[PDB]
Design a protein around this ligand. Structure first.
Ligand SMILES: Cc1ncc(COP(=O)(O)O)c(C/N=C(\CNc2ccccc2O)C(=O)O)c1O
Ligand SMILES: O=P(O)(O)OCCNS(=O)(=O)c1ccc(OC(F)(F)F)cc1
Ligand SMILES: [Cl-]
Ligand SMILES: [Cl-]
Ligand SMILES: [Cl-]
Ligand SMILES: [Cl-]
Ligand SMILES: [Cl-]
Ligand SMILES: [Cl-]
Ligand SMILES: [Cl-]
Ligand SMILES: [Cl-]
Ligand SMILES: [Cl-]
Ligand SMILES: [Cl-]
Ligand SMILES: [Cl-]
Ligand SMILES: [Cl-]
Ligand SMILES: [Cl-]
Ligand SMILES: [Cl-]
Ligand SMILES: [Cl-]
Ligand SMILES: [Cs+]
Ligand SMILES: [Cs+]
Ligand SMILES: [Cs+]
Ligand SMILES: [Cs+]
Lengths: 396, 268
C-alpha cells in the first residue's frame, strides 16, 4: 500500500525484498509530508541557493551555431557546487534523512560524482556517509574517491559480480536491508524502486523550472526542444519535468551509443534493450538472452549503466519524449567543439547531449529551432581521459 | 503434487521438524553439485532450497554471493539448472524442491512460462527474493496455475495485515525470516519469533520454516521448540563447499556430518 502510484504505466514498481518495504514506505511518507512542509522547502531552497549556488546560468552559445538557424542555450548545471546536477537532489534527500531522524547515509556511485555529492551534503549536514563503489570504479576514479574521503565519507569497494555500478547498487540495498533503522539510502538517479524515481525527479525539477523562466525572459517563448543525456535519468527528468505539459516542447533523451549500437557495446537499454526487473524496478535492461544483467559500455562513466529510470521508459512509450543515441566519437567531437568555440569544458556525459543538438543543427541548418541542452556537469574530471584518447589517435 | 503437505504430515506424525539445506545449483560445477545434492538428501535433508545462479543476488551475503560466482565460473546457466532439476526429481520422487529465484530470471521469458517449466521438471515451490507481497500477484497466480507453491517471506518487521496476506496467499511453507539483512551464517537472529509463528497458525498459514543465520543444531531445535515446522540453512552449508573445493571427497564427508547433525536436532 502506498500514497503515490509506484508505476509510470507498466514501468517502475518496488521490486525489493520484503524486509525493505517498510523503509520504502517510510521514505515515501516522509517525502509526501516534506513536500507539504514550508519549513522543509525553505531549508532546501536555502541550501540550493546559498550553498549550491542556484540559480544556474542559461548560456547562449552563438559561436557553435553560427551560419545556421539553430539558437542553442546551455543550462549550466556545470556551475553548481560539486560540478554537476547531482548536488541538487542530494541536498533534498539529506534533508529527508534528517526528517526521518536518520543519522547515516548510504550511496552508490560509479563515475564518482554522485558519491562526491553525497559526501559533500553529508559533511555539511552532519550525516555519516558510506559510499559503495564497484572495485573497478574505485581503481579508475582515484580523484573522486579521494574527494569523498577528504569530505569524511567511508568509501567501500564492491568486489562481487562485475565489480561495477550495478554491484555497488546491490551492495547499497544489501546494507540498507539491515540498517534502514538508522541509515537512509541516497540513491543517485531517477531509477530504482518507488519512491526514488519520483523523489529524484521532484528534487531535480528546478533545472527545468529555471530553464523555462530563463528562456521566456530571453526569447519570449518556450524552447522547441530540451535535450539531456540519460544515464539513469536524473538530469534528464529534472530538465523535462516542468515541460511535460507543454506539449509543443520536444523532450529528447540521449543514451550512450558506446562503440556503436550494432557492436552491442553501448548503454542504450531504453531503445536497444529489453524490459526486465532489476534494481527494484521494471524497466528496460541490457541483459543476456537468458536474463542475466549485461554489462553496458560508454566512454563516459556517468552513462555506463545497463538500465534507465521508469519515467523515461513511460514517456517514451506514450510518445511524449524521444530517445536517441550518440556514440563515443560523436561525444568526443562535441566535447572538443565546446572547449574550442565556447570556452566551456563539458562533462563527457553531457557531451552526448550536446552532440545530438549539434547533429540536429548540422543535419538541417536552415531549420529554425530554439534548443536547450542540459549541461549537467563540467568536464574537469574527463580531461585525462580525453588527453589519452587524443594522443592515441595521433592528434597528440 | 502435494510434496510439502505430505512431508509436513509425515513429520507431524513423527513429531519431527524439517531440516532444509540451501545450495546454489552448479556450485562448484554441475557434476559436483548433483553429488552434493545427493549427499544432502542421503544425510537427512527433508527438503531442498536450490538457487539458480544470478548476476545480482541482492538478498544474499558474501557466502552465497560467492557460490553464485563459482557457478558462473563453471559456466552454469538457468537452462542447465532446469536440466539438473529434472534429473534430481527423476532420482528423488518425494522430496520437496524449492527454488530461490530473482525476479528477472522468472520474468525473462514470461512469468507463466517460467512456472510451467518448474511444473514440467517437478519443482514444488518458488521464492522470488526481490518480489515483495506488494508486487507478487502475477507470480503467485502463475505459481498456483502450475501447481507450484509461492513462498512468501514473513519478516521480523511484519504486522497483522502482512501476516494475513502471507497466510492467505502462501502455500507449501511460510518463510519465517530470522532477522533483517541478507543471508549469512555470520549473523544469528536475535528476535523471538513464536508470536509470529502463533499468528500464522491462527490465520491457517502454510507451515513455517525459519531461515537466515541458521548454522547450528541448537538453532534447529529452537525453531521447532518455538512452534515452527522446521528450519532452513544455506550459508553454513555453502561454507563447507567453499572450504573443501580442493577435496571433493572431504566436501561430501563434511556435508554429510553437518546435515546429519542438523537433521538429528529436528527429531528432538
Ligand atoms: C556529470 C554527470 N552527468 C550525467 C550523469 C548521468 O546520470 P543521470 O543524470 O542520473 O542520468 C552522471 C552520472 N554519474 C554517476 C552515475 N550515476 C548513476 C547512474 C545510474 C544509476 C545510479 C547512479 O548513481 C555517478 O555515480 O556519479 C554525471 O556524473
Ligand atoms: O542460512 P542463510 O543465512 O545463508 O540463509 C539461507 C537462505 N537461503 S534461501 O534460499 O532460503 C533464501 C530465502 C530468502 C532470501 O531473500 C529474501 F528473504 F529476501 F527473499 C534469500 C535466500
Ligand atoms: Cl496511489
Ligand atoms: Cl506503459
Ligand atoms: Cl501495474
Ligand atoms: Cl507547501
Ligand atoms: Cl515561498
Ligand atoms: Cl584515496
Ligand atoms: Cl551494516
Ligand atoms: Cl509560473
Ligand atoms: Cl516575470
Ligand atoms: Cl515528437
Ligand atoms: Cl552473466
Ligand atoms: Cl504526448
Ligand atoms: Cl582549436
Ligand atoms: Cl524553420
Ligand atoms: Cl560462520
Ligand atoms: Cs545561429
Ligand atoms: Cs517541437
Ligand atoms: Cs544508460
Ligand atoms: Cs495457506
Amino acid at each position: 500500500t502506498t500514497l503515490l502510484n509506484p508505476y509510470f504505466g507498466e514501468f517502475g514498481g518496488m521490486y525489493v525484498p520484503q524486509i525493505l518495504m517498510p523503509a520504502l514506505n517510510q521514505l515515501e511518507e516522509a517525502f509526501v509530508s516534506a513536500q507539504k512542509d514550508p519549513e522543509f522547502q525553505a531549508q532546501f531552497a536555502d541550501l540550493l541557493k546559498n550553498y549550491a549556488g542556484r540559480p544556474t546560468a542559461l548560456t547562449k552559445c552563438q559561436n557553435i551555431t553560427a551560419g545556421t538557424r539553430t539558437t542553442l542555450y546551455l543550462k549550466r548545471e556545470d556551475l553548481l557546487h560539486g560540478g554537476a546536477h547531482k548536488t541538487n537532489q542530494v541536498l533534498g534527500q539529506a534533508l529527508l534523512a534528517k526528517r526521518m531522524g536518520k543519522s547515516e547515509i548510504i550511496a552508490e556511485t560509479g563515475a564518482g560524482q554522485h558519491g562526491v555529492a553525497s559526501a559533500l551534503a553529508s559533511a555539511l549536514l552532519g550525516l555519516k556517509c558510506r559510499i559503495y563503489m564497484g572495485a573497478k570504479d574505485v581503481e579508475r576514479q582515484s580523484p573522486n574517491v579521494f574527494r569523498m574521503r577528504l569530505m569524511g565519507a567511508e568509501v567501500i569497494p564492491v568486489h562481487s559480480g562485475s565489480a561495477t555500478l550495478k554491484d555497488a547498487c546491490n551492495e547499497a540495498l544489501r546494507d540498507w536491508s539491515g540498517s534502514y533503522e538508522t541509515a537512509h539510502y541516497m540513491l543517485g538517479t531517477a531509477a530504482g524502486p518507488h519512491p526514488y524515481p519520483t523523489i529524484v525527479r521532484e528534487f531535480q525539477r528546478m533545472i527545468g523550472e529555471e530553464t523555462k523562466a530563463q528562456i521566456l525572459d530571453k526569447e519570449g517563448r518556450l524552447p522547441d526542444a530540451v535535450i539531456a543525456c540519460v544515464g539513469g535519468g536524473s538530469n534528464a527528468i529534472g530538465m523535462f519535468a516542468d515541460f511535460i505539459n507543454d506539449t509543443s516542447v520536444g523532450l529528447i533523451g540521449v543514451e550512450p551509443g558506446g562503440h556503436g549500437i550494432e557492436t552491442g557495446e553501448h548503454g542504450a537499454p531504453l531503445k536497444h534493450g529489453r524490459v526486465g526487473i532489476y534494481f527494484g524496478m521494471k524497466a528496460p535492461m541490457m541483459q543476456t538472452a537468458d536474463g542475466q544483467i549485461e554489462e553496458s559500455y560508454s566512454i563516459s562513466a556517468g552513462l555506463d549503466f545497463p538500465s534507465v529510470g521508469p519515467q523515461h521508459a513511460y514517456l517514451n512509450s506514450i510518445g511524449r519524449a524521444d530517445y536517441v543515441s550518440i556514440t563515443d566519437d560523436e561525444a568526443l567531437e562535441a566535447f572538443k567543439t565546446l572547449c574550442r568555440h565556447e570556452g566551456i569544458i563539458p562533462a563527457l556525459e553531457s557531451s552526448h547531449a550536446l552532440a545530438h543538438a549539434l547533429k540536429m543543427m548540422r543535419e538541417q541548418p536552415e531549420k529554425e529551432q530554439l534548443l536547450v541542452v542540459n549541461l549537467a556537469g563540467r568536464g574537469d574530471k574527463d580531461i585525462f581521459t580525453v588527453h589519452d584518447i587524443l594522443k592515441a589517435r595521433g592528434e597528440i | 503434487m502435494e510434496r510439502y503437505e505430505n512431508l509436513f504430515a509425515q513429520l507431524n506424525d513423527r513429531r519431527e521438524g524439517a531440516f532444509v539445506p540451501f545450495v546454489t545449483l552448479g556450485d562448484p560445477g554441475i557434476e559436483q553439485s548433483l553429488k552434493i545434492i545427493d549427499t544432502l538428501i542421503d544425510a537427512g535433508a527433508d527438503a531442498l532450497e536450490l538457487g539458480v545462479p544470478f548476476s545480482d543476488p541482492l538478498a544474499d551475503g558474501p557466502t552465497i554471493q560467492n557460490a553464485n560466482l563459482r557457478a558462473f565460473a563453471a559456466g552454469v546457466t538457468p537452462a542447465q539448472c532446469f536440466e539438473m532439476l529434472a534429473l534430481i526429481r527423476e532420482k528423488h520422487p518425494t522430496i520437496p524442491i524449492g527454488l530461490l529465484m530473482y525476479a528477472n530470471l522468472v520474468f525473462n521469458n514470461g512469468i507463466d512460462a517460467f512456472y510451467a517449466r518448474c511444473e514440467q521438471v517437478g519443482v514444488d515451490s518458488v521464492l522470488v527474493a526481490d518480489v515483495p507481497v506488494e508486487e507478487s500477484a502475477p507470480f503467485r497466480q502463475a505459481a498456483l496455475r502450475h501447481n507450484i507453491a509461492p513462498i512468501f517471506i514473513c519478516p521480523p518487521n511484519a504486522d497483522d495485515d502482512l501476516l494475513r496476506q502471507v497466510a492467505s496467499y502462501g502455500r507449501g511453507y511460510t518463510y519465517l525470516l530470522s532477522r533483517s539483512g541478507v543471508t549469512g551464517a555470520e549473523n544469528r537472529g536475535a528476535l523471538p519469533l513464536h508470536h509470529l509463528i502463533e499468528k500464522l497458525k491462527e490465520y491457517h498459514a502454510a507451515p513455517a520454516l525459519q531461515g537466515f543465520g541458521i548454522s547450528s543444531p541448537e538453532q534447529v531445535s529452537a525453531a521447532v521448540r518455538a512452534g515452527a515446522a522446521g528450519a532452513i540453512s544455506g550459508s553454513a552449508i555453502v561454507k563447507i563447499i567453499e572450504k573443501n573445493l580442493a577435496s571433493p571427497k572431504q566436501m561430501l564427508a563434511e556435508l554429510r556430518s553437518f546435515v546429519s547433525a542438523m537433521k538429528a536436532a529436528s527429531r528432538a
